Amino acid sequence: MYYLKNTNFWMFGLFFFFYFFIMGAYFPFFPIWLHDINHISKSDTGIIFAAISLFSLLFQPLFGLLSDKLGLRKYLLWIITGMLVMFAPFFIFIFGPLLQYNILVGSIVGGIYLGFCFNAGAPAVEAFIEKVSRRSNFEFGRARMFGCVGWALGASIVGIMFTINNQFVFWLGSGCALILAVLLFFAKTDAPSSATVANAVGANHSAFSLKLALELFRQPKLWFLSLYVIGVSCTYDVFDQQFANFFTSFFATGEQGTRVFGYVTTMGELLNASIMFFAPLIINRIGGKNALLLAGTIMSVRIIGSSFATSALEVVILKTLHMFEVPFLLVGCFKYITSQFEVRFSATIYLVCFCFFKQLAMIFMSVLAGNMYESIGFQGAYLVLGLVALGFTLISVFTLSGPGPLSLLRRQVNEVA
Ligand SMILES: [Hg+2]
Ligand SMILES: [Hg+2]
Numbered sequence: 001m002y003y004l005k006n007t008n009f010w011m012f013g014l015f016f017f018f019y020f021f022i023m024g025a026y027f028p029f030f031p032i033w034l035h036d037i038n039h040i041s042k043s044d045t046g047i048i049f050a051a052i053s054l055f056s057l058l059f060q061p062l063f064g065l066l067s068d069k070l071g072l073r074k075y076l077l078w079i080i081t082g083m084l085v086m087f088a089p090f091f092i093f094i095f096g097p098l099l100q101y102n103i104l105v106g107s108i109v110g111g112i113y114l115g116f117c118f119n120a121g122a123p124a125v126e127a128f129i130e131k132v133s134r135r136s137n138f139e140f141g142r143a144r145m146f147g148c149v150g151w152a153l154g155a156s157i158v159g160i161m162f163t164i165n166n167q168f169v170f171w172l173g174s175g176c177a178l179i180l181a182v183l184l185f186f187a188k189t190d191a192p193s194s195a196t197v198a199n200a201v202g203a204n205h206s207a208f209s210l211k212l213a214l215e216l217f218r219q220p221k222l223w224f225l226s227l228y229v230i231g232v233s234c235t236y237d238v239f240d241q242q243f244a245n246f247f248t249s250f251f252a253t254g255e256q257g258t259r260v261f262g263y264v265t266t267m268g269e270l271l272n273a274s275i276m277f278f279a280p281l282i283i284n285r286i287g288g289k290n291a292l293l294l295a296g297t298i299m300s301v302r303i304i305g306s307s308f309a310t311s312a313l314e315v316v317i318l319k320t321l322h323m324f325e326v327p328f329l330l331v332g333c334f335k336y337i338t339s340q341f342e343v344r345f346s347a348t349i350y351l352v353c354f355c356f357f358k359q360l361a362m363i364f365m366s367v368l369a370g371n372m373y374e375s376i377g378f379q380g381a382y383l384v385l386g387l388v389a390l391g392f393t394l395i396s397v398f399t400l401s402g403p404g405p406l407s408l409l410r411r412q413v414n415e416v417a
């Protein structure tokens with residue numbers, strides 16, 4: 001019972017909530033803002049994203065690999081709030097008024113960093129946050145699942161306030177988020193007490209270097225998954241960047257796609273959370289490769305089925321699919337890698353693939369798409385990618401590591417012993 005009476009948690013669980021609320025604003029209703037407010041084109045919206053990644057690549061490495069040597073000092077994660085402070089002004093006064101104010105290239109860029117206060121940041125947050133509750137102990141797997149209510153809830157009500165007014169919203173971005181978020185930095189915690197008074201006494205560190213990667217580039221198990229991720233991911237994550245202006249049309253007004261598109265993500269959280277608190281064994285029984293393979297066919301169905309969307313309702317089910325696979329793509333991504341590759345390579349794997357590869361591919365495939373959408377329409381563009389996507393999955397069938405090699409009852413045991 002070191003929670004109801006204890007602080008940090010009862011605190012860093014709020015900051016952790018009041019953050020995602022900012023998400024529930026940004027990441028869902030961005031395209032809408034762009035298209036529906038800045039009447040911005042489909043081959044140009046593309047650029048926005050294409051641009052982002054470059055900084056969700058160009059940052060996660062500088063960030064991520066800093067936060068370590070930061071300690072329990074809040075310095076980084078403080079100058080992240082000094083952004084989510086200036087949300088409104090930026091967005092209304094300099095983002096769109098640079099985008100819309102036609103001069104695009106040059107400005108997208110000059111506004112693709114407050115893109116990091118989410119992608120690079122979010123982890124930089126979560127990460128730093130646990131060390132906060134690795135010290136004043138409790139477990140945060142009960143603290144984050146506190147901050148996962150803010151996005152769910154932040155979604156619905158922003159869909160509503162967006163129609164009421166697409167701008168009141170950019171003001172809860174600052175208040176709703178900044179002030180409180182950073183006011184939750186006055187009760188803050190520090191100074192190392194009955195364990196680890198240096199970065200080596202109790203809590204170690206997980207490093208990566210040159211020659212490991214050179215041994216990874218060596219390993220084939222990589223090249224094949226490195227494919228599955230670059231092929232069937234970068235891909236499907238394009239479909240999702242703009243599968244909103246597609247969703248919207250189908251309905252009566254604008255207060256439809258919107259007021260209700262939000263209504264779905266939201267009603268598609270529980271469905272996601274209640275699936276996962278479950279997914280573990282579901283996976284360690286179903287294997288790993290298959291847990292991705294499953295994750296695969298779905299997202300591919302999703303893409304494909306979208307090139308056929310003739311009904312609004314449809315796109316409403318074509319949606320539920322999404323948060324119906326992220327668990328498997330996520331839980332799968334793990335229980336697999338850590339089952340086919342060396343513990344030492346681990347973290348490395350998550351750069352040689354994620355913070356570096358997909359982010360590159362995804363960067364281009366956003367523009368290939370960007371244009372393409374406006375060449376055969378979402379639908380047609382959709383008939384392309386989706387097919388491409390579902391194409392790699394089939395391959396990957398042969399490309400991925402077996403469910404039981406020569407040492408699974410000898411090389412892997414970590415959750416068992
Ligand atoms: Hg907010
Ligand atoms: Hg791709």
Ligand SMILES: [Hg+2]
Binds near residue numbers: 148
């Ligand atoms: Hg969650």
Ligand SMILES: [Hg+2]
Binds near residue numbers: 330333
């Ligand atoms: Hg993942």
Ligand SMILES: [Hg+2]
Binds near residue numbers: 351
């Ligand atoms: Hg990177």
